[PDB]
């Protein structure tokens, strides 16, 4: 079976209990994770160790908190106490865990299920081939010896409009925001980087990225995490919002792909 779980945010206890509920069996089963494995929750260190041990029984995409973790580790960015990253940053195997973490994809595609995963979704301004090229480009810089320069360059909110003629730092920033930060879109598809409210509370003319028809969503299902204020609600057919705010006192949600059945683990916080 194929299982998809949203933002774990260090909620190791709830992750293991959810996986025991469905009797997840490495080897017979595969786990897809929407990223943001770390921060906010108490057990970011245990979650990384466990997800890394899954090997090819796990298909991960990196979220914005994963990237922030890598920026702190490399001394690019300052640690926020609220993130509870210190046990992970101070662990003896932190190098091993974070070098593995930076080599993970931004995008996962399964042609047989016609299923696509990214942390925040697929911008409607991208077709599949553009999405893949963009993920390859940012993954290539993240798995390189020079990744702290990228992590520094990535921070920013412009440009917010895709073009195949975007070059250099601006192309990198947009790619990073589209995969890990996107929520709302203007009618033309351009990213809005500031609103994190629910769709009904958002100011016009903002609509959610998935309410704007795009080439990927028309041929593929898309699963994503990231957008907690959506609460997993209000998406169209074929769009699966899996982040139900576990770290925030919501729930950890698992979707089994074969039968589209949901399993829910309440937050222990
Ligand atoms: Mn996120
Ligand atoms: Mn998140």
PDB file of C-alpha atoms and ligand atoms in Angstrom:
ATOM      1  CA  UNK A   1       0.000   0.000   0.000  1.00  0.00           C
ATOM      2  CA  UNK A   2       0.892   3.697  -0.535  1.00  0.00           C
ATOM      3  CA  UNK A   3       0.429   6.093   2.420  1.00  0.00           C
ATOM      4  CA  UNK A   4       0.707   9.892   2.276  1.00  0.00           C
ATOM      5  CA  UNK A   5       1.150  11.924   5.480  1.00  0.00           C
ATOM      6  CA  UNK A   6       1.260  15.712   5.790  1.00  0.00           C
ATOM      7  CA  UNK A   7       3.493  17.987   7.879  1.00  0.00           C
ATOM      8  CA  UNK A   8       4.898  15.974  10.765  1.00  0.00           C
ATOM      9  CA  UNK A   9       6.718  18.995  12.367  1.00  0.00           C
ATOM     10  CA  UNK A  10       8.656  16.923  14.803  1.00  0.00           C
ATOM     11  CA  UNK A  11       5.568  15.110  16.101  1.00  0.00           C
ATOM     12  CA  UNK A  12       7.348  11.778  16.296  1.00  0.00           C
ATOM     13  CA  UNK A  13       4.913  10.125  18.734  1.00  0.00           C
ATOM     14  CA  UNK A  14       1.898  10.880  16.545  1.00  0.00           C
ATOM     15  CA  UNK A  15       3.737   9.754  13.410  1.00  0.00           C
ATOM     16  CA  UNK A  16       4.576   6.339  14.848  1.00  0.00           C
ATOM     17  CA  UNK A  17       1.100   5.836  16.262  1.00  0.00           C
ATOM     18  CA  UNK A  18      -0.492   6.735  12.932  1.00  0.00           C
ATOM     19  CA  UNK A  19       1.844   4.334  11.092  1.00  0.00           C
ATOM     20  CA  UNK A  20       1.028   1.566  13.604  1.00  0.00           C
ATOM     21  CA  UNK A  21      -2.687   2.199  13.043  1.00  0.00           C
ATOM     22  CA  UNK A  22      -2.306   1.347   9.332  1.00  0.00           C
ATOM     23  CA  UNK A  23       0.306  -1.370  10.070  1.00  0.00           C
ATOM     24  CA  UNK A  24       2.867   0.292   7.842  1.00  0.00           C
ATOM     25  CA  UNK A  25       5.339  -2.349   6.702  1.00  0.00           C
ATOM     26  CA  UNK A  26       8.564  -1.208   5.006  1.00  0.00           C
ATOM     27  CA  UNK A  27       9.067  -3.402   1.973  1.00  0.00           C
ATOM     28  CA  UNK A  28       5.387  -4.049   1.268  1.00  0.00           C
ATOM     29  CA  UNK A  29       4.327  -0.406   1.786  1.00  0.00           C
ATOM     30  CA  UNK A  30       5.595   3.043   0.728  1.00  0.00           C
ATOM     31  CA  UNK A  31       5.317   6.289   2.658  1.00  0.00           C
ATOM     32  CA  UNK A  32       5.039   9.695   0.983  1.00  0.00           C
ATOM     33  CA  UNK A  33       5.726  12.707   3.199  1.00  0.00           C
ATOM     34  CA  UNK A  34       4.868  16.319   2.331  1.00  0.00           C
ATOM     35  CA  UNK A  35       7.935  17.795   4.126  1.00  0.00           C
ATOM     36  CA  UNK A  36       8.318  20.030   7.137  1.00  0.00           C
ATOM     37  CA  UNK A  37       9.441  17.005   9.142  1.00  0.00           C
ATOM     38  CA  UNK A  38      11.040  19.265  11.750  1.00  0.00           C
ATOM     39  CA  UNK A  39      10.507  22.298  13.996  1.00  0.00           C
ATOM     40  CA  UNK A  40       7.694  23.232  16.394  1.00  0.00           C
ATOM     41  CA  UNK A  41       7.236  19.629  17.556  1.00  0.00           C
ATOM     42  CA  UNK A  42       9.375  18.080  20.329  1.00  0.00           C
ATOM     43  CA  UNK A  43      10.800  15.196  18.268  1.00  0.00           C
ATOM     44  CA  UNK A  44      12.489  16.601  15.143  1.00  0.00           C
ATOM     45  CA  UNK A  45      15.631  14.576  15.939  1.00  0.00           C
ATOM     46  CA  UNK A  46      13.677  11.267  16.174  1.00  0.00           C
ATOM     47  CA  UNK A  47      11.636  12.026  13.036  1.00  0.00           C
ATOM     48  CA  UNK A  48      14.713  12.579  10.880  1.00  0.00           C
ATOM     49  CA  UNK A  49      16.413   9.465  12.155  1.00  0.00           C
ATOM     50  CA  UNK A  50      13.334   7.400  11.465  1.00  0.00           C
ATOM     51  CA  UNK A  51      12.458   8.855   8.019  1.00  0.00           C
ATOM     52  CA  UNK A  52      16.087   8.483   6.893  1.00  0.00           C
ATOM     53  CA  UNK A  53      16.095   4.844   7.987  1.00  0.00           C
ATOM     54  CA  UNK A  54      13.070   4.101   5.753  1.00  0.00           C
ATOM     55  CA  UNK A  55      15.311   4.348   2.690  1.00  0.00           C
ATOM     56  CA  UNK A  56      13.387   3.823  -0.546  1.00  0.00           C
ATOM     57  CA  UNK A  57      10.227   3.011   1.457  1.00  0.00           C
ATOM     58  CA  UNK A  58       9.868   6.788   1.857  1.00  0.00           C
ATOM     59  CA  UNK A  59       9.313   9.448  -0.800  1.00  0.00           C
ATOM     60  CA  UNK A  60       9.919  12.880   0.716  1.00  0.00           C
ATOM     61  CA  UNK A  61       9.734  16.444  -0.534  1.00  0.00           C
ATOM     62  CA  UNK A  62      11.461  19.249   1.349  1.00  0.00           C
ATOM     63  CA  UNK A  63       9.328  21.970   2.962  1.00  0.00           C
ATOM     64  CA  UNK A  64      10.151  25.493   4.070  1.00  0.00           C
ATOM     65  CA  UNK A  65      11.057  24.418   7.611  1.00  0.00           C
ATOM     66  CA  UNK A  66      13.380  21.732   6.306  1.00  0.00           C
ATOM     67  CA  UNK A  67      15.102  24.469   4.295  1.00  0.00           C
ATOM     68  CA  UNK A  68      15.168  26.756   7.320  1.00  0.00           C
ATOM     69  CA  UNK A  69      16.751  23.957   9.367  1.00  0.00           C
ATOM     70  CA  UNK A  70      19.499  23.583   6.750  1.00  0.00           C
ATOM     71  CA  UNK A  71      20.061  27.355   6.814  1.00  0.00           C
ATOM     72  CA  UNK A  72      20.540  27.281  10.589  1.00  0.00           C
ATOM     73  CA  UNK A  73      22.830  24.254  10.436  1.00  0.00           C
ATOM     74  CA  UNK A  74      25.078  26.013   7.881  1.00  0.00           C
ATOM     75  CA  UNK A  75      25.172  29.248   9.903  1.00  0.00           C
ATOM     76  CA  UNK A  76      23.177  31.155   7.287  1.00  0.00           C
ATOM     77  CA  UNK A  77      20.218  31.858   9.603  1.00  0.00           C
ATOM     78  CA  UNK A  78      19.590  32.263  13.323  1.00  0.00           C
ATOM     79  CA  UNK A  79      17.907  29.572  15.431  1.00  0.00           C
ATOM     80  CA  UNK A  80      14.482  30.495  16.773  1.00  0.00           C
ATOM     81  CA  UNK A  81      13.940  29.022  20.277  1.00  0.00           C
ATOM     82  CA  UNK A  82      10.292  28.277  19.395  1.00  0.00           C
ATOM     83  CA  UNK A  83      11.458  25.831  16.697  1.00  0.00           C
ATOM     84  CA  UNK A  84      12.976  23.389  19.241  1.00  0.00           C
ATOM     85  CA  UNK A  85      15.796  22.464  16.829  1.00  0.00           C
ATOM     86  CA  UNK A  86      18.580  22.358  19.456  1.00  0.00           C
ATOM     87  CA  UNK A  87      18.555  18.591  20.236  1.00  0.00           C
ATOM     88  CA  UNK A  88      18.779  17.929  16.484  1.00  0.00           C
ATOM     89  CA  UNK A  89      21.464  20.537  15.807  1.00  0.00           C
ATOM     90  CA  UNK A  90      23.496  19.246  18.794  1.00  0.00           C
ATOM     91  CA  UNK A  91      23.111  15.517  18.079  1.00  0.00           C
ATOM     92  CA  UNK A  92      26.284  13.563  17.243  1.00  0.00           C
ATOM     93  CA  UNK A  93      24.791  12.366  13.948  1.00  0.00           C
ATOM     94  CA  UNK A  94      23.546  15.825  12.941  1.00  0.00           C
ATOM     95  CA  UNK A  95      25.975  16.058  10.005  1.00  0.00           C
ATOM     96  CA  UNK A  96      24.807  12.658   8.726  1.00  0.00           C
ATOM     97  CA  UNK A  97      21.118  13.536   9.116  1.00  0.00           C
ATOM     98  CA  UNK A  98      21.312  16.995   7.549  1.00  0.00           C
ATOM     99  CA  UNK A  99      23.506  15.988   4.616  1.00  0.00           C
ATOM    100  CA  UNK A 100      20.987  13.281   3.832  1.00  0.00           C
ATOM    101  CA  UNK A 101      18.136  15.775   4.296  1.00  0.00           C
ATOM    102  CA  UNK A 102      19.573  18.253   1.825  1.00  0.00           C
ATOM    103  CA  UNK A 103      19.798  15.551  -0.874  1.00  0.00           C
ATOM    104  CA  UNK A 104      16.052  14.857  -0.887  1.00  0.00           C
ATOM    105  CA  UNK A 105      13.791  15.988  -3.741  1.00  0.00           C
ATOM    106  CA  UNK A 106      11.451  18.974  -3.948  1.00  0.00           C
ATOM    107  CA  UNK A 107       9.076  17.095  -6.234  1.00  0.00           C
ATOM    108  CA  UNK A 108       7.911  13.472  -6.417  1.00  0.00           C
ATOM    109  CA  UNK A 109       6.101  12.021  -9.442  1.00  0.00           C
ATOM    110  CA  UNK A 110       4.518   8.552  -9.840  1.00  0.00           C
ATOM    111  CA  UNK A 111       3.385   8.099 -13.447  1.00  0.00           C
ATOM    112  CA  UNK A 112       1.580   4.830 -12.703  1.00  0.00           C
ATOM    113  CA  UNK A 113      -0.643   6.543 -10.115  1.00  0.00           C
ATOM    114  CA  UNK A 114      -0.472   9.828 -12.066  1.00  0.00           C
ATOM    115  CA  UNK A 115       0.301  11.385  -8.682  1.00  0.00           C
ATOM    116  CA  UNK A 116       2.446  14.450  -7.980  1.00  0.00           C
ATOM    117  CA  UNK A 117       3.779  15.653  -4.592  1.00  0.00           C
ATOM    118  CA  UNK A 118       5.396  18.940  -3.607  1.00  0.00           C
ATOM    119  CA  UNK A 119       5.323  20.691  -0.254  1.00  0.00           C
ATOM    120  CA  UNK A 120       3.074  23.628  -1.210  1.00  0.00           C
ATOM    121  CA  UNK A 121       1.811  22.354  -4.562  1.00  0.00           C
ATOM    122  CA  UNK A 122       2.399  23.066  -8.241  1.00  0.00           C
ATOM    123  CA  UNK A 123       2.054  26.659  -9.377  1.00  0.00           C
ATOM    124  CA  UNK A 124      -0.517  26.851 -12.199  1.00  0.00           C
ATOM    125  CA  UNK A 125       2.150  28.683 -14.231  1.00  0.00           C
ATOM    126  CA  UNK A 126       4.125  25.421 -14.531  1.00  0.00           C
ATOM    127  CA  UNK A 127       3.612  22.379 -16.715  1.00  0.00           C
ATOM    128  CA  UNK A 128       5.059  19.093 -15.599  1.00  0.00           C
ATOM    129  CA  UNK A 129       8.255  19.455 -17.646  1.00  0.00           C
ATOM    130  CA  UNK A 130       8.903  22.907 -16.192  1.00  0.00           C
ATOM    131  CA  UNK A 131       8.188  21.691 -12.662  1.00  0.00           C
ATOM    132  CA  UNK A 132      10.683  18.853 -13.147  1.00  0.00           C
ATOM    133  CA  UNK A 133      13.388  21.096 -14.589  1.00  0.00           C
ATOM    134  CA  UNK A 134      12.911  23.512 -11.691  1.00  0.00           C
ATOM    135  CA  UNK A 135      13.090  20.803  -9.041  1.00  0.00           C
ATOM    136  CA  UNK A 136      16.204  19.376 -10.651  1.00  0.00           C
ATOM    137  CA  UNK A 137      17.830  22.825 -10.630  1.00  0.00           C
ATOM    138  CA  UNK A 138      17.186  23.554  -6.948  1.00  0.00           C
ATOM    139  CA  UNK A 139      17.944  19.980  -5.816  1.00  0.00           C
ATOM    140  CA  UNK A 140      21.255  20.242  -7.754  1.00  0.00           C
ATOM    141  CA  UNK A 141      22.329  23.272  -5.746  1.00  0.00           C
ATOM    142  CA  UNK A 142      21.097  21.792  -2.467  1.00  0.00           C
ATOM    143  CA  UNK A 143      23.065  18.560  -2.909  1.00  0.00           C
ATOM    144  CA  UNK A 144      26.237  20.440  -3.856  1.00  0.00           C
ATOM    145  CA  UNK A 145      29.200  21.332  -1.685  1.00  0.00           C
ATOM    146  CA  UNK A 146      28.174  24.992  -2.106  1.00  0.00           C
ATOM    147  CA  UNK A 147      24.663  24.709  -0.681  1.00  0.00           C
ATOM    148  CA  UNK A 148      25.109  27.467   1.986  1.00  0.00           C
ATOM    149  CA  UNK A 149      25.401  30.065  -0.775  1.00  0.00           C
ATOM    150  CA  UNK A 150      22.075  28.875  -2.222  1.00  0.00           C
ATOM    151  CA  UNK A 151      20.363  28.846   1.171  1.00  0.00           C
ATOM    152  CA  UNK A 152      21.426  32.465   1.618  1.00  0.00           C
ATOM    153  CA  UNK A 153      20.316  33.454  -1.889  1.00  0.00           C
ATOM    154  CA  UNK A 154      16.952  31.655  -1.591  1.00  0.00           C
ATOM    155  CA  UNK A 155      15.504  34.110   0.967  1.00  0.00           C
ATOM    156  CA  UNK A 156      13.214  36.638  -0.702  1.00  0.00           C
ATOM    157  CA  UNK A 157       9.722  37.271  -2.015  1.00  0.00           C
ATOM    158  CA  UNK A 158      10.393  38.426  -5.594  1.00  0.00           C
ATOM    159  CA  UNK A 159      10.046  37.734  -8.416  1.00  0.00           C
ATOM    160  CA  UNK A 160       6.524  36.284  -8.081  1.00  0.00           C
ATOM    161  CA  UNK A 161       5.873  35.619 -11.773  1.00  0.00           C
ATOM    162  CA  UNK A 162       7.289  32.672 -13.657  1.00  0.00           C
ATOM    163  CA  UNK A 163       8.941  33.108 -17.002  1.00  0.00           C
ATOM    164  CA  UNK A 164      11.277  30.720 -18.842  1.00  0.00           C
ATOM    165  CA  UNK A 165      13.524  33.787 -19.221  1.00  0.00           C
ATOM    166  CA  UNK A 166      14.070  34.151 -15.464  1.00  0.00           C
ATOM    167  CA  UNK A 167      17.796  33.727 -14.774  1.00  0.00           C
ATOM    168  CA  UNK A 168      20.107  33.538 -11.807  1.00  0.00           C
ATOM    169  CA  UNK A 169      19.072  34.468  -8.292  1.00  0.00           C
ATOM    170  CA  UNK A 170      15.554  35.473  -9.263  1.00  0.00           C
ATOM    171  CA  UNK A 171      14.807  32.139 -10.903  1.00  0.00           C
ATOM    172  CA  UNK A 172      16.098  30.299  -7.847  1.00  0.00           C
ATOM    173  CA  UNK A 173      14.011  32.380  -5.417  1.00  0.00           C
ATOM    174  CA  UNK A 174      10.795  31.897  -7.387  1.00  0.00           C
ATOM    175  CA  UNK A 175      11.322  28.146  -7.734  1.00  0.00           C
ATOM    176  CA  UNK A 176      11.914  27.915  -3.974  1.00  0.00           C
ATOM    177  CA  UNK A 177       8.837  29.981  -3.096  1.00  0.00           C
ATOM    178  CA  UNK A 178       6.585  28.051  -5.509  1.00  0.00           C
ATOM    179  CA  UNK A 179       7.524  24.635  -4.133  1.00  0.00           C
ATOM    180  CA  UNK A 180       7.787  25.509  -0.402  1.00  0.00           C
ATOM    181  CA  UNK A 181       5.821  28.707   0.385  1.00  0.00           C
ATOM    182  CA  UNK A 182       2.996  29.135  -2.165  1.00  0.00           C
ATOM    183  CA  UNK A 183      -0.603  29.396  -0.993  1.00  0.00           C
ATOM    184  CA  UNK A 184      -2.592  32.097  -2.778  1.00  0.00           C
ATOM    185  CA  UNK A 185      -2.381  33.217  -6.375  1.00  0.00           C
ATOM    186  CA  UNK A 186      -3.522  36.276  -8.272  1.00  0.00           C
ATOM    187  CA  UNK A 187      -5.869  35.557 -11.211  1.00  0.00           C
ATOM    188  CA  UNK A 188      -2.883  35.535 -13.606  1.00  0.00           C
ATOM    189  CA  UNK A 189      -1.130  32.857 -11.501  1.00  0.00           C
ATOM    190  CA  UNK A 190       1.465  35.112  -9.823  1.00  0.00           C
ATOM    191  CA  UNK A 191       2.359  34.132  -6.271  1.00  0.00           C
ATOM    192  CA  UNK A 192       1.197  36.087  -3.243  1.00  0.00           C
ATOM    193  CA  UNK A 193       3.799  35.694  -0.500  1.00  0.00           C
ATOM    194  CA  UNK A 194       2.004  37.299   2.456  1.00  0.00           C
ATOM    195  CA  UNK A 195      -1.440  35.785   3.080  1.00  0.00           C
ATOM    196  CA  UNK A 196      -1.519  32.649   5.249  1.00  0.00           C
ATOM    197  CA  UNK A 197      -5.260  32.718   6.091  1.00  0.00           C
ATOM    198  CA  UNK A 198      -7.909  30.230   4.996  1.00  0.00           C
ATOM    199  CA  UNK A 199      -9.378  30.631   1.473  1.00  0.00           C
ATOM    200  CA  UNK A 200     -12.652  32.130   2.754  1.00  0.00           C
ATOM    201  CA  UNK A 201     -10.774  34.681   4.912  1.00  0.00           C
ATOM    202  CA  UNK A 202      -8.371  35.708   2.153  1.00  0.00           C
ATOM    203  CA  UNK A 203      -8.690  39.151   0.512  1.00  0.00           C
ATOM    204  CA  UNK A 204      -9.821  39.350  -3.095  1.00  0.00           C
ATOM    205  CA  UNK A 205      -8.731  38.793  -5.795  1.00  0.00           C
ATOM    206  CA  UNK A 206      -6.548  36.136  -4.123  1.00  0.00           C
ATOM    207  CA  UNK A 207      -7.565  32.549  -4.838  1.00  0.00           C
ATOM    208  CA  UNK A 208      -5.791  29.348  -3.761  1.00  0.00           C
ATOM    209  CA  UNK A 209      -3.234  28.076  -6.226  1.00  0.00           C
ATOM    210  CA  UNK A 210      -5.378  24.977  -6.836  1.00  0.00           C
ATOM    211  CA  UNK A 211      -8.472  27.037  -7.790  1.00  0.00           C
ATOM    212  CA  UNK A 212      -6.609  28.169 -10.923  1.00  0.00           C
ATOM    213  CA  UNK A 213      -6.568  25.475 -13.639  1.00  0.00           C
ATOM    214  CA  UNK A 214      -3.040  24.442 -14.543  1.00  0.00           C
ATOM    215  CA  UNK A 215      -1.545  21.871 -16.894  1.00  0.00           C
ATOM    216  CA  UNK A 216      -0.337  19.588 -14.117  1.00  0.00           C
ATOM    217  CA  UNK A 217      -3.557  19.410 -12.117  1.00  0.00           C
ATOM    218  CA  UNK A 218      -5.438  18.590 -15.349  1.00  0.00           C
ATOM    219  CA  UNK A 219      -3.475  15.357 -15.938  1.00  0.00           C
ATOM    220  CA  UNK A 220      -2.338  14.484 -12.396  1.00  0.00           C
ATOM    221  CA  UNK A 221      -3.526  14.353  -8.835  1.00  0.00           C
ATOM    222  CA  UNK A 222      -1.508  16.611  -6.547  1.00  0.00           C
ATOM    223  CA  UNK A 223      -0.838  15.969  -2.864  1.00  0.00           C
ATOM    224  CA  UNK A 224       0.711  18.697  -0.712  1.00  0.00           C
ATOM    225  CA  UNK A 225       1.168  19.855   2.872  1.00  0.00           C
ATOM    226  CA  UNK A 226       2.301  23.256   4.160  1.00  0.00           C
ATOM    227  CA  UNK A 227      -1.006  25.170   4.289  1.00  0.00           C
ATOM    228  CA  UNK A 228      -2.290  24.444   7.801  1.00  0.00           C
ATOM    229  CA  UNK A 229      -5.055  27.086   7.785  1.00  0.00           C
ATOM    230  CA  UNK A 230      -6.730  25.152   4.937  1.00  0.00           C
ATOM    231  CA  UNK A 231      -7.248  22.391   7.526  1.00  0.00           C
ATOM    232  CA  UNK A 232      -7.322  19.824   4.694  1.00  0.00           C
ATOM    233  CA  UNK A 233     -10.657  21.267   3.494  1.00  0.00           C
ATOM    234  CA  UNK A 234     -12.123  22.855   0.410  1.00  0.00           C
ATOM    235  CA  UNK A 235      -9.961  21.367  -2.344  1.00  0.00           C
ATOM    236  CA  UNK A 236     -11.221  20.250  -5.780  1.00  0.00           C
ATOM    237  CA  UNK A 237     -11.307  16.691  -7.048  1.00  0.00           C
ATOM    238  CA  UNK A 238      -7.780  15.430  -7.521  1.00  0.00           C
ATOM    239  CA  UNK A 239      -6.156  17.872  -5.055  1.00  0.00           C
ATOM    240  CA  UNK A 240      -5.225  16.449  -1.653  1.00  0.00           C
ATOM    241  CA  UNK A 241      -4.318  18.856   1.155  1.00  0.00           C
ATOM    242  CA  UNK A 242      -2.745  16.660   3.797  1.00  0.00           C
ATOM    243  CA  UNK A 243      -1.518  19.177   6.415  1.00  0.00           C
ATOM    244  CA  UNK A 244      -4.062  19.194   9.245  1.00  0.00           C
ATOM    245  CA  UNK A 245      -1.985  21.085  11.805  1.00  0.00           C
ATOM    246  CA  UNK A 246      -0.699  18.276  14.032  1.00  0.00           C
ATOM    247  CA  UNK A 247       2.077  20.416  15.545  1.00  0.00           C
ATOM    248  CA  UNK A 248      -0.579  23.100  16.133  1.00  0.00           C
ATOM    249  CA  UNK A 249      -2.871  20.829  18.144  1.00  0.00           C
ATOM    250  CA  UNK A 250      -4.814  19.676  15.089  1.00  0.00           C
ATOM    251  CA  UNK A 251      -4.300  16.162  13.722  1.00  0.00           C
ATOM    252  CA  UNK A 252      -1.785  14.090  11.754  1.00  0.00           C
ATOM    253  CA  UNK A 253      -3.515  12.805   8.612  1.00  0.00           C
ATOM    254  CA  UNK A 254      -2.601   9.769   6.526  1.00  0.00           C
ATOM    255  CA  UNK A 255      -4.269   8.992   3.183  1.00  0.00           C
ATOM    256  CA  UNK A 256      -3.985   5.495   1.769  1.00  0.00           C
ATOM    257  CA  UNK A 257      -3.785   5.869  -2.015  1.00  0.00           C
ATOM    258  CA  UNK A 258      -5.262   2.574  -3.184  1.00  0.00           C
ATOM    259  CA  UNK A 259      -8.656   3.227  -1.596  1.00  0.00           C
ATOM    260  CA  UNK A 260      -8.434   6.969  -0.776  1.00  0.00           C
ATOM    261  CA  UNK A 261      -9.104   6.154   2.864  1.00  0.00           C
ATOM    262  CA  UNK A 262      -8.064   8.605   5.592  1.00  0.00           C
ATOM    263  CA  UNK A 263      -6.594   7.708   8.998  1.00  0.00           C
ATOM    264  CA  UNK A 264      -6.296  10.377  11.667  1.00  0.00           C
ATOM    265  CA  UNK A 265      -4.073  10.668  14.755  1.00  0.00           C
ATOM    266  CA  UNK A 266      -4.976  13.400  17.259  1.00  0.00           C
ATOM    267  CA  UNK A 267      -2.247  15.718  18.488  1.00  0.00           C
ATOM    268  CA  UNK A 268      -0.729  14.934  21.903  1.00  0.00           C
ATOM    269  CA  UNK A 269      -0.055  18.619  22.533  1.00  0.00           C
TER     270      UNK A 269
HETATM  271 MN1  LIG B   1       5.462  24.497   5.052  1.00  0.00          MN
HETATM  272 MN1  LIG B   2       4.329  23.286   7.860  1.00  0.00          MN
END
